[PDB]
Amino acid sequence: SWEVGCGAPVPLVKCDENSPYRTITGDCNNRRSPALGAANRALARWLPAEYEDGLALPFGWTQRKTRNGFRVPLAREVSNKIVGYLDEEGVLDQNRSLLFMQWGQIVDHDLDFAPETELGSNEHSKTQCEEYCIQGDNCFPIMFPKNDPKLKTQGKCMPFFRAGFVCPTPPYQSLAREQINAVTSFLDASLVYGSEPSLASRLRNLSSPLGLMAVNQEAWDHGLAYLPFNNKKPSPCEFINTTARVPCFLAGDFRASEQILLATAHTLLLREHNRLARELKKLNPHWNGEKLYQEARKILGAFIQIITFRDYLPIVLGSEMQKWIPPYQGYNNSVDPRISNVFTFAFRFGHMEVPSTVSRLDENYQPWGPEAELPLHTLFFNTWRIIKDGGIDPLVRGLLAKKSKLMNQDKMVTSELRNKLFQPTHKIHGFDLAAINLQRCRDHGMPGYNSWRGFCGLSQPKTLKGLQTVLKNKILAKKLMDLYKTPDNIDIWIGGNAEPMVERGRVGPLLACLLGRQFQQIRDGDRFWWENPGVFTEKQRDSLQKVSFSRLICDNTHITKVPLHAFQANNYPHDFVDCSTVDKLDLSPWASREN
Ligand code: HEM
Ligand SMILES: *[C@@H]1O[C@H](CO)[C@@H](O[C@@H]2O[C@H](CO)[C@@H](O)[C@H](O)[C@H]2NC(C)=O)[C@H](O)[C@H]1NC(C)=O
Ligand SMILES: *[C@@H]1O[C@H](CO)[C@@H](O[C@@H]2O[C@H](CO)[C@@H](O)[C@H](O)[C@H]2NC(C)=O)[C@H](O)[C@H]1NC(C)=O
Ligand SMILES: *[C@@H]1O[C@H](CO)[C@@H](O)[C@H](O)[C@H]1NC(C)=O
Ligand SMILES: *[C@@H]1O[C@H](CO)[C@@H](O)[C@H](O)[C@H]1NC(C)=O
Ligand SMILES: NC(=O)c1cnccn1
Ligand SMILES: NC(=O)c1cnccn1
Ligand SMILES: [Ca+2]
Ligand SMILES: [Zn+2]
């Protein structure tokens, strides 16, 4: 009965089966089904979508329509009563660097992107939603509850537009709405190179046969490269400071400039590609542009995969790492490599790891200048602070020496994100990411908390006392029950993040299962996984095994002192060393001798 499937909007595929390299769109990875994992196709559904009308209306759209007999609470009311807090003191993670939060953002970006629908061009459809808060079509405004401080200073709501969906942009009516993943599902550095041919070419430097990525020609970081500017107007980065008038950066991913430390991470990755390309050129003078670029791109992809699976996932999943991601056993073409719609919400556990401020530190790892520490919100879409205020080095020192925020049942998300988020085209630092996450969860037709608990083989609390035991928190379960009248209605983003973290990890049991299962598939179902026999030669793998985020910093910045385990909390100068005692990536095995 279940159909072969739709996909009118989706592009046609032709595959070079000889190709030793990935496509930019992800197509051709799986040979039997070439479109699996490819960008711009529907996110996978691990469970049937749950919409108010079974097809496309989110729960909460029709006021009179209940979910399981109860009205769903406003996303902003759950944010105000459960997610927010005042005191930032004592909220830091004693054993994770700020780099741990940032890498999580980088990895998410590489894997999934579900952009708001496109209809606002030559239209006030976007202007109206914002200006008048009238719910309709793609406009699904986040209404402020009665006692909300924002009602007094910001109006009746926060604009919010429904995510883009496959086939008709216009709503379909026989089968459940499926949201689109605009990027490639493989952990493949698509955030650096782009997931569309159109964008991938624009990022390259084709003026020279060196396989380099294009760089900024208007500014340099003490001779080091910056990413090219996106000269698209309007620009949110110019808008945050019309006097500095510095635009956003142009990277393989559309969100690169959202916050200063993400732009910073993208810069290091870009520098790495060119550094690898230059190096390869030396060793194999005979290799042309396409060759160099594809080879450096392939090494960068492996670097990202290694740092992620070897350093990052174990300290996220703790004790559950083995359970869900057993040691590698090779490529399995039977595995669905597609990112699931629920994983795009599970991975948002990172939102509770973002601290309230960002620091710039000098070569002594001491405050750099008079305004060295800055509130996070002044840093959304902020490029000028990097270009006109010291480059990226002082920021990278902060990523190593400062701490991530620790998830806390009583202090979930910092007000820098919960009350002062800046959204492009909107003019103010007054949005709420936590509310947007909850409204989105509904937009995507997410099944509720207990459906996912069942999916992960975990208990399904039906009462306040039952929920109290699962969350090991009486007061939190009581607020959740007061808001959602049954655990069955609790949105997965908030339910999953409310659970106490597993041993040696940073997420609860439910998230560990959703995340673990996804990463296992991402690895096992990738024909181009770095450790799959034949992708790299065995000597190349011996060389890749040494990659480290410390080495990445050393080779692409002017920082000469770094920790050996960049993700753990590290203090200067004790946990820091000279870049000379740190393993280098040895590109000797890439010397291809032919004659
Ligand atoms: C200051 C740092 C961060 C900012 C400002 C931020 C901001 C945002 C915003 C504005 C959205 C779009 C929300 C929506 O429209 O539904 C989003 C989505 C998302 N965020 Fe974050 N975020 C940050 C950190 C992170 C971290 C550390 C992680 C992971 C460890 C992460 C994971 C995600 C994921 C998976 C999505 C959904 C992406 C997609 O599939 O569309 N975020 N973030
Ligand atoms: C594309 O690559 C060319 C060649 O590397 C770049 O041109 C040069 O700019 C460098 C700075 O990296 C100068 O030192 C040289 O005068 C030029 N070098 C050569 C070998 O000609 C060009 O800037 C690149 N274009 C973009 C947009 O990145
Ligand atoms: C926007 O960017 C400008 C340009 O850098 C900032 O102006 C600088 O800030 C301090 C003075 O407070 C000085 O260190 C710089 O020399 C200033 N330059 C100039 C030309 O004034 C400005 O503070 C930023 N404004 C906002 C709102 O972010
Ligand atoms: C390959 O993947 C399929 C589908 O997920 C799975 O059932 C099977 O056990 C995997 N094969 C091996 C050898 O693990
Ligand atoms: C600090 O973190 C690392 C993992 O990154 C771990 O090996 C070490 O035991 C941690 N220390 C404590 C006290 O948890
Ligand atoms: N961290 C994120 O996933 C993100 C960052 N900026 C915009 C949208 N999403
Ligand atoms: N924060 C964001 O959603 C974002 C990031 N980059 C470009 C546009 N929007
Ligand atoms: Ca990808
Ligand atoms: Zn310098």
XYZ file of C-alpha atoms in Angstrom, residues 95-529:
435
model
C 34.496 19.690 32.814
C 33.583 20.811 29.317
C 35.283 23.651 27.433
C 33.205 26.175 25.459
C 34.601 24.310 22.406
C 32.333 21.331 23.324
C 29.221 23.428 22.798
C 30.589 24.945 19.529
C 31.588 21.639 17.952
C 28.063 20.403 18.617
C 26.742 23.300 16.607
C 29.191 22.578 13.785
C 28.252 18.937 13.579
C 24.491 19.753 13.615
C 25.045 22.191 10.740
C 26.804 19.675 8.662
C 23.876 17.190 9.082
C 20.540 19.031 8.954
C 18.863 22.266 7.914
C 15.118 22.749 7.619
C 14.622 26.369 6.321
C 11.438 28.415 6.730
C 9.198 28.342 3.624
C 9.878 30.759 0.713
C 6.910 33.041 -0.083
C 8.062 36.381 1.425
C 9.672 37.582 -1.827
C 7.775 40.581 -3.393
C 5.364 40.173 -0.455
C 4.406 41.594 2.929
C 3.183 38.023 3.802
C 6.193 38.128 6.188
C 5.527 41.813 7.017
C 1.880 41.020 7.964
C 2.675 37.958 10.146
C 5.057 40.133 12.113
C 3.088 43.345 12.094
C -0.284 41.817 12.814
C 0.249 38.381 14.304
C -2.535 36.804 12.283
C -2.152 33.064 12.002
C -2.350 31.733 8.466
C -0.854 29.443 5.886
C 2.865 29.538 6.650
C 2.513 32.171 9.377
C 2.307 30.449 12.781
C 2.978 33.201 15.256
C 4.201 32.540 18.779
C 1.627 34.287 20.977
C 2.717 35.708 24.314
C 0.844 34.473 27.409
C -1.072 36.946 29.646
C 1.645 37.837 32.236
C 4.421 38.093 29.759
C 6.892 40.961 30.102
C 7.170 40.980 26.214
C 3.483 41.701 25.796
C 4.193 45.102 27.417
C 7.199 45.960 25.256
C 6.958 43.886 22.057
C 3.368 43.445 21.071
C 1.186 40.371 20.814
C 3.613 37.777 19.510
C 6.900 36.768 17.905
C 6.738 36.007 14.156
C 7.312 32.411 13.155
C 7.057 30.811 9.745
C 6.433 27.129 9.002
C 9.349 25.046 7.689
C 9.640 24.213 4.002
C 8.191 20.832 2.864
C 8.680 18.439 -0.056
C 6.758 18.369 -3.318
C 4.342 21.300 -3.351
C 5.532 24.389 -1.499
C 1.800 25.011 -1.372
C 0.076 22.626 1.024
C -0.760 19.122 -0.182
C -3.856 17.180 1.041
C -3.629 13.342 1.004
C -0.442 12.546 2.816
C 1.285 13.953 5.865
C 3.506 16.987 5.425
C 7.169 16.032 5.191
C 9.781 18.815 6.039
C 12.955 19.099 3.978
C 16.582 18.600 5.005
C 18.460 21.210 2.855
C 21.814 19.761 3.605
C 23.556 16.370 3.162
C 22.890 13.741 5.840
C 26.458 12.425 5.721
C 29.022 13.903 8.084
C 30.950 15.222 5.097
C 31.999 18.860 5.703
C 29.046 20.105 3.640
C 29.000 23.141 5.996
C 32.282 24.116 4.490
C 31.720 23.215 0.847
C 28.058 23.640 0.457
C 25.332 21.072 -0.302
C 24.278 22.590 -3.770
C 26.400 22.761 -6.979
C 25.392 26.373 -7.441
C 26.863 27.353 -4.034
C 29.821 24.944 -4.063
C 31.321 26.592 -7.146
C 30.861 30.148 -5.844
C 32.979 29.193 -2.757
C 35.863 27.981 -4.818
C 38.824 29.913 -6.093
C 38.874 29.014 -9.749
C 41.261 31.867 -10.746
C 44.171 29.571 -9.927
C 44.641 25.800 -10.448
C 45.475 25.253 -6.769
C 42.126 23.838 -5.563
C 41.717 26.589 -3.020
C 38.582 27.968 -1.495
C 37.946 31.660 -2.163
C 38.959 34.065 0.582
C 38.189 37.599 1.694
C 39.965 40.175 -0.439
C 38.856 43.157 1.651
C 40.355 42.140 4.986
C 42.894 39.761 6.495
C 43.610 38.484 9.961
C 47.204 39.556 10.368
C 47.898 37.893 7.029
C 45.530 34.953 7.701
C 42.420 34.324 5.667
C 38.898 35.361 6.369
C 35.848 33.932 4.661
C 34.558 35.971 1.716
C 31.686 38.313 2.498
C 28.228 37.464 1.345
C 27.427 40.601 -0.599
C 23.681 39.853 -0.494
C 21.502 42.683 0.766
C 19.799 43.133 3.122
C 22.425 41.819 5.544
C 21.665 41.012 9.196
C 25.331 41.464 10.057
C 25.403 44.977 8.580
C 22.111 45.720 10.366
C 23.490 44.987 13.843
C 25.977 47.834 13.346
C 25.375 50.123 10.338
C 28.456 52.113 11.227
C 30.853 49.214 11.025
C 28.890 48.038 7.986
C 30.556 44.638 7.954
C 28.425 41.942 6.155
C 28.038 38.289 7.027
C 30.412 35.654 5.762
C 29.756 33.317 2.842
C 30.340 29.682 3.766
C 29.204 26.205 2.698
C 26.354 26.694 5.169
C 23.696 29.362 5.270
C 23.943 29.915 9.098
C 27.648 30.486 9.463
C 27.356 33.985 10.809
C 24.559 33.358 13.351
C 26.963 33.800 16.232
C 30.596 34.917 16.406
C 32.074 31.610 17.626
C 30.347 29.664 14.835
C 31.807 32.112 12.246
C 35.110 31.578 14.039
C 34.856 27.764 13.711
C 33.991 28.070 10.007
C 37.072 30.290 9.500
C 39.396 27.669 10.929
C 37.859 24.990 8.657
C 38.288 27.170 5.564
C 41.916 27.918 6.519
C 42.425 24.146 6.963
C 41.235 23.360 3.425
C 43.639 25.850 1.789
C 46.467 24.730 4.088
C 45.816 21.116 3.019
C 45.557 22.113 -0.652
C 48.852 24.018 -0.594
C 50.548 21.171 1.090
C 49.294 18.571 -1.395
C 50.418 20.762 -4.257
C 53.960 20.659 -2.847
C 53.943 16.845 -2.500
C 52.200 16.140 -5.788
C 53.068 19.033 -8.106
C 51.374 17.162 -10.905
C 47.862 17.161 -9.423
C 45.445 19.683 -11.028
C 42.838 21.971 -9.341
C 39.904 19.601 -9.194
C 42.198 16.899 -7.865
C 43.685 19.083 -5.092
C 40.318 20.430 -4.024
C 38.663 17.029 -3.983
C 41.594 15.536 -2.003
C 41.770 18.330 0.621
C 37.887 18.241 0.851
C 38.069 14.462 1.503
C 40.685 14.846 4.232
C 38.677 17.640 5.942
C 35.579 15.394 5.832
C 37.569 12.655 7.601
C 38.881 15.136 10.155
C 35.332 16.153 11.013
C 34.216 12.532 11.244
C 37.109 11.636 13.562
C 36.814 14.504 15.952
C 33.129 13.782 16.138
C 33.108 10.085 16.695
C 36.245 9.759 18.656
C 36.306 12.864 20.856
C 32.820 14.373 20.908
C 30.237 11.585 20.930
C 31.824 9.621 23.829
C 31.566 12.666 26.145
C 27.990 13.388 25.020
C 26.695 9.839 25.237
C 28.789 8.585 28.121
C 27.766 5.077 29.184
C 25.325 4.805 26.289
C 27.982 5.292 23.653
C 28.739 1.534 23.433
C 25.168 0.531 23.495
C 24.261 2.563 20.444
C 27.412 3.032 18.481
C 29.449 -0.156 18.759
C 33.011 -0.132 17.350
C 32.958 0.125 13.523
C 32.311 -3.010 11.533
C 32.263 -1.615 7.988
C 29.821 -0.143 5.473
C 26.298 -1.451 5.443
C 24.320 -0.527 2.370
C 21.124 -1.687 4.169
C 21.295 1.238 6.624
C 19.154 4.366 6.148
C 21.763 7.227 6.247
C 18.994 9.894 6.326
C 18.746 12.303 9.260
C 15.351 11.814 10.980
C 12.987 14.684 11.705
C 13.155 13.872 15.505
C 17.008 13.997 15.549
C 16.840 17.694 14.363
C 15.080 18.346 17.712
C 17.178 15.919 19.841
C 20.402 17.678 18.763
C 19.006 20.967 20.048
C 20.165 19.762 23.501
C 23.076 22.109 22.659
C 20.857 25.130 23.338
C 21.127 24.365 27.055
C 24.984 24.310 26.839
C 25.333 27.927 25.623
C 26.670 30.288 28.303
C 25.646 33.953 28.741
C 28.871 35.550 27.606
C 31.811 35.158 25.227
C 35.421 36.233 26.002
C 38.373 37.420 23.937
C 41.706 36.412 25.608
C 45.311 37.596 24.902
C 48.501 35.480 24.443
C 48.690 35.107 28.237
C 45.057 33.871 28.072
C 44.093 36.976 30.043
C 41.267 39.420 29.207
C 42.001 41.006 25.848
C 41.313 44.716 26.096
C 38.775 46.590 28.308
C 35.534 44.953 27.033
C 36.987 41.417 26.826
C 33.858 39.652 27.981
C 30.665 40.381 26.099
C 26.987 39.360 26.473
C 26.116 36.614 23.965
C 23.274 38.564 22.438
C 25.510 41.360 21.169
C 27.276 38.633 19.199
C 24.455 37.204 17.000
C 25.264 37.951 13.301
C 28.382 39.719 14.425
C 31.178 39.824 12.020
C 32.475 43.325 12.780
C 33.861 42.276 16.191
C 36.016 39.707 14.421
C 37.158 41.972 11.579
C 37.502 45.209 13.440
C 38.378 43.902 16.899
C 41.248 41.431 16.862
C 40.667 38.647 14.449
C 39.712 35.149 15.556
C 42.605 34.234 17.748
C 41.332 35.930 20.952
C 38.005 34.137 20.378
C 39.632 30.746 19.875
C 41.539 31.153 23.155
C 38.137 31.761 24.780
C 36.770 28.549 23.216
C 39.636 26.662 24.874
C 39.775 28.359 28.194
C 36.211 29.124 29.047
C 33.517 26.609 29.859
C 30.278 25.452 28.274
C 27.104 26.005 30.261
C 25.954 22.840 32.061
C 22.388 21.692 31.478
C 20.427 22.245 34.681
C 16.802 21.298 35.413
C 16.355 24.667 37.163
C 18.403 26.775 34.640
C 17.829 25.463 31.168
C 18.432 28.151 28.642
C 20.166 31.455 29.147
C 18.109 34.620 28.601
C 20.664 35.718 26.001
C 18.921 33.062 23.803
C 15.589 32.895 25.682
C 14.739 36.595 25.573
C 17.241 38.366 23.315
C 17.613 36.259 20.190
C 18.049 38.227 16.962
C 16.331 36.853 13.776
C 17.181 38.158 10.330
C 14.624 40.480 8.848
C 13.310 41.081 12.207
C 14.769 44.188 13.765
C 15.085 43.391 17.469
C 17.023 41.417 20.073
C 13.815 40.056 21.455
C 13.187 36.491 20.331
C 13.048 33.225 22.323
C 14.876 30.173 20.922
C 13.299 27.786 23.442
C 9.786 28.900 22.338
C 10.831 28.689 18.700
C 12.113 25.144 19.328
C 8.733 24.125 20.875
C 6.691 25.839 18.150
C 8.930 24.061 15.554
C 8.489 20.677 17.223
C 4.723 21.194 16.614
C 5.351 22.626 13.075
C 7.151 19.312 12.222
C 4.310 17.142 13.549
C 6.330 15.608 16.272
C 4.888 12.685 18.200
C 4.871 13.425 21.929
C 7.346 12.475 24.765
C 5.852 9.061 25.597
C 5.723 7.943 21.995
C 9.543 8.502 21.892
C 10.049 6.913 25.314
C 8.251 3.791 23.858
C 10.360 3.989 20.668
C 13.498 3.872 22.866
C 12.180 1.005 25.038
C 11.826 3.245 28.091
C 8.944 3.617 30.519
C 6.000 5.843 29.738
C 4.964 7.900 32.802
C 1.223 8.514 33.012
C 0.974 10.398 36.261
C 2.653 13.229 38.133
C 4.341 10.707 40.512
C 5.454 8.613 37.553
C 6.916 11.674 35.765
C 8.602 12.746 39.039
C 10.463 9.419 39.176
C 11.553 9.544 35.539
C 12.813 13.164 35.868
C 14.106 12.665 39.443
C 12.645 16.116 40.125
C 9.416 16.827 41.909
C 9.043 20.504 41.058
C 9.916 20.292 37.386
C 7.447 17.342 36.844
C 4.833 19.350 38.668
C 5.293 22.388 36.352
C 5.237 20.162 33.311
C 2.067 18.449 34.474
C 0.415 21.765 35.187
C 1.204 22.933 31.694
C 0.802 19.741 29.607
C -1.920 17.861 31.354
C -0.412 14.530 30.534
C 3.129 13.385 29.901
C 1.825 12.124 26.535
C 1.549 15.817 25.399
C 4.971 17.013 26.515
C 6.917 18.253 23.480
C 9.979 16.053 22.804
C 12.456 18.900 22.839
C 11.554 19.836 26.415
C 10.797 16.283 27.584
C 14.067 14.847 26.331
C 16.081 17.706 27.807
C 14.347 17.504 31.167
C 15.789 14.090 31.864
C 18.844 13.810 34.215
C 22.039 13.093 32.283
C 23.476 9.626 31.953
C 26.848 8.758 33.582
C 29.839 10.358 31.861
C 27.459 12.037 29.409
C 25.579 15.324 28.868
C 22.182 14.046 27.765
C 19.493 11.900 29.412
C 18.520 8.282 28.461
C 15.919 9.260 25.847
C 18.162 11.673 23.960
C 21.111 9.190 24.146
C 18.941 6.659 22.332
C 17.682 9.095 19.597
C 21.139 10.647 19.104
C 23.046 7.329 19.312
C 20.827 5.575 16.839
C 21.196 8.496 14.390
C 25.012 8.731 14.565
C 25.282 4.933 14.282
C 23.293 5.162 10.959
C 25.228 8.221 9.803
C 28.422 6.190 10.169
C 27.285 2.710 9.075
C 25.306 3.869 6.024
C 28.005 6.076 4.523
C 29.921 4.523 1.586
C 32.480 7.212 2.060
C 33.028 6.849 5.813
